[PDB]
Specification:
Chain A: Belongs to the peptidase S9B family. DPPIV subfamily. Chain A: Keywords: Aminopeptidase, Cell adhesion, Cell junction, Cell membrane, Cell projection, Disulfide bond, Glycoprotein, Host-virus interaction, Hydrolase, Membrane, Protease, Receptor, Secreted, Serine protease, Signal-anchor, Transmembrane, Transmembrane helix. The structure is a homodimer. The two termini of chain A are 20 Å apart. In chain A, α8 crosses α9. In chain A, the strands form ten sheets. In chain A, strands 35-36-38-37-39-40-41-42 form an eight-stranded mixed beta sheet, sandwiched between helices. In chain A, strands 11, 12, 13, 16 and 17 form a five-stranded antiparallel beta sheet that branches. In chain A, strands 18, 19, 20, 21 and 22 form a five-stranded antiparallel beta sheet that branches. Helices cover 15% and strands 34% of the residues of chain A. The first copy, chain A, has two domains: 470 residues, Methanol Dehydrogenase, Chain A (8 Propeller), CATH 2.140.10; 258 residues, Alpha/Beta hydrolase fold, catalytic domain (Rossmann fold). Chain A is an alpha+beta fold and 728 residues long. Chain A has 13 helices and 42 strands. At the A-B interface, β14, α12, β42 and α13 of A face β17, β18, α11, β46 and α12 of B. The complex binds a molecule of 3 linked components (NAG-NAG-BMA) (2 copies), a molecule of 3 linked components (NAG-NDG-MAN), a molecule of 3 linked components (NAG-NDG-FUC), a molecule of 3 linked components (NAG-NAG-FUC), a molecule of 2 linked components (NAG-NAG) (4 copies), a molecule of 2 linked components (NAG-NDG) and 3 more. The site of one diisopropyl phosphonate (DFP) has 9 residues of chain A, from loops. The site of a molecule of 2 linked components (NAG-NDG) has 7 residues of chain A, from loops.
């Protein structure tokens, strides 16, 4: 008895992980979505009490894809007719429901096919984007006010980011920021007039007689980038003029001088907004702190409040310039910047004082700032046990930085080593999210003493099911190379016999600041591979990886497709050395950046891997977007770094692919890593006459995540691997 | 015993079939482009002379891929900067060499990116199309006369065809026709304005940062087709001070009622031209015989003088209505039409008499009329031995239809059963081209007494090489499916022993009027599969087959994806029961239409086939072009045949692929059978949960014939086939 974790078990999602999605509406309560009905909870005692139930919205017809309640709690936006676009972007229909009269507002409805809706942070004002133009609703039922008239499809964006700004810059779609109070409405405008369009076919259902051509403004390496502008309009003046004027906030000169980006915008106070800019050469960054001049009605940014942040050994921040966390009065803020020893830590900034004051240690980094009160500052880091693959919640005392307390480390050191967190409105309560190494564990706490209130979810059910199946184990250790340690991860098969020689599959990503070796508990393809197929699925964070200091993260600066690739190969060598690895059966696979590395490795001529699989890989850095690529590669010009752009392609290694079994896969409708990238790979292989396996996924994007598609690829991928290892 | 015919041999083309392409310049001489230079031959004796060392242009500065001599023998049109477009179309730069002065003409040269060029039929005039407009030069060095001014890229085509007219109705890019002595220049105009555009990506060289979107006006089943017009312009009456006047020939009235096509144009005399129109529902066809009117300047197509060609069982013609062959005085003509019983034979017409008279009859078909003189009518049919997969040159006496003589049947019955022919201007001499069952044989003959003058190329070189290798054999036989007999062929391994069992691959195409079973000698992939891998490669012509009468051909009318596919399973099912076939190792593959039938068969649930390979297949008929599809399917409308359109798709059979090993191959830049076709097959198989093998070829067209992609696709297929069998 006691079966194993089968492929179907994975694909069919038999053994599911329970979550506990919260949503703090106040500082004492939160909303819990239970599919059918959505009730509210009292953090204090844990009172149930339904806020809105299933039937409360029946006889409606359209299935409510999502909700969103106004701050003042009088209205509720109903999101239906949802139509996903990119990662965060999506078009949809909206209806507002009045809770003070249990009536569905029917006048002046929000336009169908609206791109984005935002409640004001206070009250019940609305701001939305339709046809790339911003509109404002002072009252949910009254007609709205047009804010911009320049909106133009694929050309001018107001209130919404373009493709690149959504995925790489703001890692979000919304390009508008309501002032804390709700008086001002700040927004960015993107001009993509000059930006080249990526075009690819989209077949749709058989019913479509003619394929469609999807064309999106997408700037590739060194191409023409969109331009940006920032505006701030006063919504209180809307009911007084007819056409409120949007004040523009320009400069800095050090930015206007050349190609630049808008990377951050966060309000500090009712009349103070901070803005961060970045040159296309992401080695320099400028933060302006602007105040509203009640006299001129203009926004001013004193140079005495301008903070610069440049990097010499690489780029600024992990993926973008750090984020500002202002204190209440808005006269100072906290930011995560690498110290002199190249480690990312928190330091205190005085808006008019240029030098910050670090408040955190050394060898280890702070992952992010979670909450800031008058008392303490809550942050998550990997300081505990010195393991960079772990994550915990610490609390540092603002009046004595020598007083730092870990709030999650000892809650359950065995089962919980990787934490996430969510504080209530004023940080009176917080929910902890343990995701490993044991089964997820959700708990609620009160900030006063950090006393555990109760267990919201312990996945007890799942624990009972998994003890009936031969689950694999996971070793998280490190290996020392060139007098410096690099962590690796290994999903070991049931009853691991260090005497036997197992076949090994190297799971790889290796991108800048990435981390494949951690304490997170997972139920993925690797689980099945080790549990059923008895294959060791190992991952290694070599040079280029992050969370271990710049010295390591910046190793591949201006040099992608090198050390990151080399270390990956060496990890295997180091693994076989351990003696429980069958050298004749060593594979490697990755997705996107992983596909890139997997492919660069398979073409190294090393002779360490027998076969490999590349999914939606990158072939040459000139085919990827500007913001990400240039951040590490610089410019594809002979004056900058063109030389390395051409030396790091996968096509240039085509000839060496004759020594390994290769499997190429990619979705034909991938807006991120274009099908073009794999198209050039196959073509090069055909030119040097190298036989390989190929698989394309009609109309699948980068995720190739559609239910059927997802099941189809892992199934195909599996036959490949079993065949390469001589299984079953 | 010697070595076998390996996959490399085929891919590297180590064994080549010598050819002998000649081009008659008169009734007594022909040109033969030898290695470097071009020579002229006197058919009478065999002696020849040089015409130009080719080295004459060693310092032309450009590479030349073609040399076109004026019928005059006075000028040479040199073609360079060749850039291929579709099957026939392409653009190029041109230059003219004046032989009278042995010098390149420099003044008023032809525009770069020219789309087409053609000498007058007799002297040295020129009609070329540039930027979709027509131009005419009366003399190589003189200015060009602008014939048309309406040309427009992807919208209006003057003198040139659009994608569909190029591939499905004229099998050519040229859309202009000179009159016999070159006085008149007839041309068609295509308006593709409302025609939808197929769009796909072309990634080009690694260097291109952004993929380019190729887009071409292509009418799929039932979409808006291009409209067409016909004009005739007089080249002897055009000034450089006045725009040319092109008279338009309209009608027929029976054709303007709905959508129609211009499917044929053939001059009858210096002032008589014939036109054949075909309704969008390729059931009805009308031929006009328009005459020029001196004192009017118009062209009159007298009714009563027009002939109608219709069918009640299918479409007209094998692929389109046959070409007319007018007599000397152009008062009567001969043309191949279908019998009362459905067999194609030569009918004798009179431009005024409605009914014609069949001059040939029987249960076999005339493949095509090759030459006509006052004495005889030379044609090619599959009468001999009664096997439809054979071809011979026959001639019938025009004064006594009882006196017909085969001119090729007995020359070499063992080696030659499939002939081609090429007569000289006045059919004084003719070149017979034998293509099987043995090595190609090229010979010359004189019509006066059908004497065999001399051997041109007997392929003696290649013969000696082959006997040093174990070559497979070919069995051309038949089986009887309830009353009717259908022919098949079998590529058998070396030293075939019926006492042994062999794995079988069913090479299929099976589209309307096709023939995969014949006597032609081929040196393809199957050669290797049988010679090296000892695999029997069988082909079978079932319902829908051609050259065997209409009862067989029109059998799949309005019903594609039925009998031709089912008969493929039946043929294969009986093949297994032959004794030398390993019923456990039977595969099937096809290209294009062959891919569709392969896919339909694999998804029929027969269980007869173990694995199959589909190359650039058709998945659903609404995806293919109008002219071709609708010819057999009509329109995809519920009032018409929309139901079958929906019933004959590949994807609908997705769930049935769980019992077979499928390999889907397709070129991303296939402009003919769009990649979309296979992208829908792959998607359907993913929705049903069927795992399969796939292989796309970026930027490859329907042919997948680029040097590398070619060697690559056949290498991937071989691994698959032998993996499925071993
Ligand atoms: C988005 O950016 C584009 C530039 O990529 C801006 O377009 C440019 O707009 C200017 C006027 O503001 C145009 O110049 C003017 O052109 C007219 C007529 O062509 C001429 O009479 C004037 O003397 C002047 O030259 C310019 O053509 C145009 N350039 C391009 C490439 O489009 C556009 O204004 C920006 N949109 C927004 C909302 O800021
Ligand atoms: C609310 O106010 C804004 C800003 O005043 C208005 O937008 C501006 O409207 C003008 C007129 O349509 C736009 O066009 C301009 O036309 C002149 C004359 O042809 C030309 O010289 C300018 O270069 C410009 O093209 C102008 O671009 C536009 N400016 C902005 C920032 O949008 C808006 O129309 C007003 N809304 C209402 C309802 O009145
Ligand atoms: C090629 O074929 C075109 C039609 O397919 C010819 O055109 C004609 O048809 C158009 C419609 O496409 C007619 O209407 C146009 O003008 C009206 C304005 O009144 C618009 O509302 C409409 O949308 C069209 O744009 C045209 O009147 C008609 N003639 C012309 C000259 O356009 C086109 O002319 C033809 N070209 C050739 C060389 O034959
Ligand atoms: C091929 O030679 C032709 C001459 O052949 C000679 O005369 C025959 C009657 C016969 O005896 C044969 O054995 C001799 O070699 C020659 O044909 C004639 O016509 C051409 C027309 O261009 C003329 O130029 C030539 O002078 C004529 N010759 C004679 C003898 O009258 C022909 O030119 C030549 N063809 C080629 C392509 O070389
Ligand atoms: C057809 O074009 C070729 C190629 O030149 C192109 O067109 C030119 C106008 C210019 O835009 C180039 O960059 C293009 O590549 C013409 O080539 C000629 O070449 C000779 C030397 O070899 C040079 O002196 C000429 O200036 C070039 N152009 C012309 C018009 O002579 C070619 O001549 C063109 N043919 C015709 C009939 O115009
Ligand atoms: C021949 O016909 C063409 C086509 O109309 C004439 O060219 C046009 O002339 C007008 C008036 O000068 C221009 O507005 C057009 O742009 C020209 N081109 C086209 C396509 O219309 C040409 O002038 C005529 N020549 C003679 C001698 O009649
Ligand atoms: C080509 O054929 C045309 C048409 O028959 C000939 O042109 C006619 O010639 C006669 C006298 O020979 C004239 O009366 C007619 O007016 C001409 N018709 C036209 C439309 O021009 C022409 O002679 C022949 N060409 C040659 C070289 O013989
Ligand atoms: C060519 O085919 C058409 C239909 O594709 C025939 O026209 C009629 O079409 C209707 C459908 O609308 C059928 O029900 C009829 O049987 C068809 N015939 C008649 C007389 O109505 C048309 O007959 C065919 N052409 C010929 C010459 O038979
Ligand atoms: C919050 O919004 C603004 C933020 O400064 C508060 O202040 C008003 O700001 C406007 C700016 O347009 C000034 O014109 C007013 O004079 C300011 N009022 C005061 C009392 O200072 C505003 O008071 C707050 N509004 C609400 C509804 O709380
Ligand atoms: C940030 O990187 C840029 C990359 O362009 C560097 O800018 C260029 O100019 C410098 C002098 O001002 C040179 O020293 C750099 O070599 C040159 N960079 C390139 C790629 O050519 C800039 O120096 C860097 N600045 C910091 C503070 O690191
Ligand atoms: C939860 O109940 C609250 C009342 O508190 C009650 O009295 C205290 C002393 C405790 O005994 C507590 O357990 C009791 O519930 C309400 O004020 C509150 O609104 C309730 N919360 C919800 C969501 O209904
Ligand atoms: C939204 O679109 C639907 C579908 O066309 C329509 O029924 C409805 O009236 C629209 N509502 C608004 C406010 O436009
Ligand atoms: P991929 O790895 O895409 C993921 C970020 C989704 O692309 C590289 C360039 C990071
Ligand atoms: P394919 O078989 O194309 C051939 C003409 C090569 O397309 C079908 C529709 C006939």
């Amino acid at each position: 008895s006691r079966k194993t974790y089968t492929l179907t078990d994975y694909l069919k999602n038999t053994y599911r992980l329970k979550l506990y999605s919260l949503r703090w509406i106040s500082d004492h309560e939160y909303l819990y979505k239970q599919e059918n009905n959505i009730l509210v909870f009292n953090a204090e005692y844990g009172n149930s009490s339904v806020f809105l139930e299933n039937s409360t919205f029946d006889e409606f017809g359209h299935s409510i894809n999502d909700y969103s309640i106004s701050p003042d709690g009088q209205f509720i936006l109903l999101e239906y007719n949802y139509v996903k676009q990119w990662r965060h972007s999506y078009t949809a229909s909206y209806d507002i429901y009045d809770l003070n009269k249990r009536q569905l507002i029917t006048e002046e409805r929000i336009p169908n096919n609206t791109q984005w809706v935002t409640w004001s942070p206070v009250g019940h004002k609305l701001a939305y984007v339709w046809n790339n133009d911003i509109y404002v609703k002072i009252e949910p039922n009254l007609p709205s006010y047009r804010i911009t008239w320049t909106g133009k499809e694929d050309i001018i964006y107001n209130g919404i980011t373009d493709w690149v700004y959504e995925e790489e810059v703001f890692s979000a779609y919304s390009a508008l920021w309501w002032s804390p109070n709700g008086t001002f409405l700040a927004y960015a405008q993107f001009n993509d007039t000059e930006v080249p369009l990526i075009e690819y076919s989209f077949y749709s259902d058989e019913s479509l007689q003619y394929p469609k051509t999807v064309r999106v403004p997408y700037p590739k390496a060194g191409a023409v980038n969109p331009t940006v502008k920032f505006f701030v309009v006063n919504t209180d003046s809307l009911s007084s003029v007819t056409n409120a004027t949007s004040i523009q906030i320009t400069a800095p000169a050090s930015m206007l001088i050349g190609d630049h980006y808008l990377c951050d915008v966060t309000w500090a106070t009712q009349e103070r907004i901070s803005l961060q800019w970045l040159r296309r050469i992401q080695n320099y960054s400028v933060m302006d702190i602007c105040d509203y001049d009640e006299s001129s009605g203009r926004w001013n940014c004193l140079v005495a409040r301008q903070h610069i942040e440049m990097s010499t050994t690489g780029w600024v921040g992990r993926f973008r310039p750090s984020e500002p966390h202002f204190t209440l009065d808005g006269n100072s803020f906290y930011k995560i910047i690498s110290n002199e020893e190249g480690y990312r830590h928190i330091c205190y900034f005085q808006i008019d004082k240029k030098d910050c004051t670090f408040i955190t240690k050394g060898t280890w980094e702070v992952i992010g700032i979670e909450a800031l009160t008058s008392d303490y500052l809550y942050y998550i880091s990997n300081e505990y046990k010195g393991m960079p693959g772990g994550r915990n919640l610490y609390k540092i005392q603002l009046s004595d930085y020598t007083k730092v307390t870990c709030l999650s480390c000892e809650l359950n050191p065995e089962r919980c080593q990787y934490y996430s967190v969510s504080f209530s409105k004023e940080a009176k309560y917080y929910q902890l999210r343990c995701s490993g190494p044991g089964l997820p564990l959700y708990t609620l706490h009160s900030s006063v003493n950090d006393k555990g209130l109760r267990v919201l979810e312990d996945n007890s059910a799942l624990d009972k099911m998994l003890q009936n199946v031969q689950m694999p184990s996971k070793k998280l250790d490190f290996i020392i190379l060139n007098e410096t340690k690099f962590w690796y991860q290994m999903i070991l098969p049931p009853h691991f016999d260090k005497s036997k020689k197992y076949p090994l599959l190297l799971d790889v990503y290796a991108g800048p600041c990435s981390q494949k070796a951690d304490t997170v508990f997972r139920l993925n393809w690797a689980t099945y591979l080790a549990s059923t197929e008895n294959i060791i699925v190992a991952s290694f964070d070599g040079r280029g990886s992050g969370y271990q200091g710049d010295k390591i993260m910046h190793a591949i600066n201006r040099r992608l497709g090198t050390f990151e690739v080399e270390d990956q190969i060496e990890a295997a060598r180091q693994f076989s050395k351990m003696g429980f690895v069958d050298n004749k059966r060593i594979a490697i696979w990755g997705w996107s950046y992983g596909g890139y590395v997997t492919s660069m490795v398979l073409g190294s001529g090393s002779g360490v891997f027998k076969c490999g699989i590349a999914v939606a890989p990158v072939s040459r850095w000139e085919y990827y977007d500007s913001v990400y690529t240039e951040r590490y590669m610089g410019l594809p010009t002979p004056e900058d770094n063109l030389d390395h752009y051409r030396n790091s392609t996968v096509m240039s290694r085509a000839e060496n692919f004759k020594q390994v079994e290769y499997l190429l896969i990619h979705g034909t409708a991938d807006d991120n890593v274009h099908f073009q990238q794999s198209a050039q790979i196959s073509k090069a292989l055909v030119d040097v006459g190298v036989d390989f396996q190929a698989m394309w996924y009609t109309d699948e994007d980068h995720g190739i995540a559609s239910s059927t598609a997802h099941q189809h690829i892992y199934t195909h991928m599996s036959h490949f691997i079993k065949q390469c290892f001589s299984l079953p």
